[PDB]
Every structure is written in C-alpha cells, then in structure tokens.
C-alpha cells in the first residue's frame, strides 16, 4: 500500500512518548502561541450578568519529541491522536459552563509539522461572567472580559503568548454578531499575571 508508510511514521511517533510530561519538563518553559477567531458573539443575558461567545480557539507549541521525517511536511491527524499526546490544559477563568462541540465528531484537529510544531484548533461555545455597573441603565456601557490560561502549570512551566501582535490576534467575523440590544464597538487584547494560592499563572485576556 502506498500510504502504509505514513502509518509506520505514526507508529514511530508515539514509541516511548510519555504524555504525562510537558514538552520541556525541568529543562525549558513550554511557550504556547494562542489566538481566537470569534465566530459569533452570542446574546448578552443581562439578567445573569453573563454573555456568550462562539470561538475557534486555536493554540500552537513546539514538542521536539514529535519531530519526524516523511513525504509530507505536515500530518493532519484525527481528534483521537490529540487525546493520545500531551496538550495544554487552558481554561477560561471567568467561564461558567461551556461545551466543546462534538457534532458529528469532536471539532478538533491536529497538525504536526516536521520541525515538531503543533497546531491544536478547537470550536468552543463559552458563556462567561460579564460584571456590570447598571448606574446609567439603559444608557450604560460594559467591558465583558474573556480571560484564559493554564490550570496546572505556573509561570515557570507554561507561558502563553499571542501569535500575531495583540491587536490583530483576536479576530471577529463580520457577519457573526448575535447581539440583540447591544452593539459591539470593539475589543482590547492584553496579557497579565494572576497570583493564586497554588502559584503564579499567566492569564491572557480580551475585553
């Protein structure tokens, strides 16, 4: 078979690959380059002080263990292989109850490049808290945050970065705007630190 060689390459990738350890445990810091494509800004439920957003949250990082050589320069793998290897545990700090869409199957993909760079795109629907000061109601304005970061790994272990410059990393689709009574003027992208009880973590935010 022509393509059987590719299977062998896959069978050679996971040989000895311990998924429990991050790419650089005790040697480096696993830099993660992340960015969002807001496919649709969902309705803002002022009753719950909550809003909804549907995003193609996509991340990338370098894992030297998965370096290979073969015919194609990029391997586009199924969602199962993502579960088979290490991936970041990014979550949303202000999120309430989101769902990763899996219709018809998990909306995930993995692209392993020859140099070891990965690309793990998702399709999330995050409904997150948007605190409000309704002193000027109905003539008020809000800044709903979307703050995300690693759950387990501190600053010394995992650090997040924006792929492009911060302003142009987060992109909102023009046709996608489900807001009824609100108007989306724009977004501001930033990064910062949170010092929790366990340790210090990087939190990447979009207001």
């Amino acid at each position, epitope marked *: 078979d022509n393509t059987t060689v590719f299977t062998r390459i896959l069978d050679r990738l996971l040989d000895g690959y311990d998924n429990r350890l991050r790419p650089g445990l005790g040697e480096r810091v696993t830099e993660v380059k992340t960015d969002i494509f807001v496919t649709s800004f969902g309705p803002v439920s002022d009753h719950d002080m909550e809003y909804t957003i549907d995003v193609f949250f996509r991340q990338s990082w370098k894992d030297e263990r998965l370096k290979f050589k073969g015919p194609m320069t990029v391997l586009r793998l199924n969602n199962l292989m993502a579960s088979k290897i290490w991936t970041p545990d990014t979550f949303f*700090h*202000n999120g309430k109850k989101s769902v990763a869409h899996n219709m018809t199957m998990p909306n995930k993909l993995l692209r392993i490049t020859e140099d070891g760079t990965l690309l793990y795109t998702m399709r999330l629907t995050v409904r997150a808290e948007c*605190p409000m*000061h309704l002193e000027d109601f109905p003539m008020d*304005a*809000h*800044a709903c*945050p979307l*703050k995300f970061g690693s759950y387990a790994y501190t600053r010394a272990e995992v650090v997040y970065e924006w792929t492009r410059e911060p302003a142009r990393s987060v992109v909102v689709a023009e046709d996608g705007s489900r807001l009824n009574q609100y108007d989306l*003027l*724009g977004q*501001t992208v*930033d*990064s*910062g*630190i*949170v*010092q*929790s009880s366990t340790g210090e973590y990087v*939190v990447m*935010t979009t*207001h």
Partner: nanobody, 108 residues
C-alpha cells in the same frame, strides 16, 4: 531604593471596579504602571514589568504598589485611579475616579 505607595478609597465599594496606578513625569505624558481586577489579575506596563508589584485589599478597599529598583528617571507624580475599563485598561480616559497624586523623587 524600595518604597510602598498606598491608596485608600472612601465613599464607594470598589470591589467590582478595576484599580490602577498611573505615572506622570514632568512633560505632560501620563504613563500606565499597573492595574488589578476583581479577579486578582495583574497587568503591567513594559517599562516596569517585574520592578513594581500591585496588590489589592478588598476588605479594606485599597490598592498598594510596592516599588523596587527605583532609578533616577522614575521621579514623577503617581496617581491612583479606579473605574471599569471601557475602551481602556491602559488609557486614562477609561477611569472616572482619580487620586490627588503623590510626588516621588529619586536622588543619587
């Protein structure tokens, strides 16, 4: 040298507001220094990343700034500000409350 600049709010609970510090060197150019959210998340300016540390005390409704590694160019008036970040979080236009300001001078 090391210093600590405190700011206490009275007349309103700023638990849900974003509390920040700003700098004004002589020359009329307000510079962002640090800011802290309801979620304890700290943002900093690139000039003072890791030199100054911002903190908040929500029970006492105050914001503190611990300054380390003061250099002679850091002489300036430091202002304490609060307000939700609308079109901002790094711009003075988004803050509707400001402190009287405190002069700080560094002499070698």
């Amino acid at each position: 040298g090391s210093l600590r600049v405190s700011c206490a709010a009275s007349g309103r609970t700023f638990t849900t507001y974003i509390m920040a510090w700003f700098r004004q060197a002589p020359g009329k150019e307000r510079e962002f220094l640090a800011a802290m959210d309801q979620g304890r998340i700290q943002y900093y300016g690139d000039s003072v990343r890791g030199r100054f540390t911002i903190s908040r005390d929500y029970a006492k409704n105050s914001v503190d700034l611990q300054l380390d590694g003061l250099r002679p160019e850091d002489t300036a008036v430091y202002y304490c500000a609060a307000g939700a970040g609308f079109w901002g979080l790094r711009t003075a236009s988004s803050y509707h409350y400001w402190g009287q300001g405190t002069q700080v001078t560094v002499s070698s």
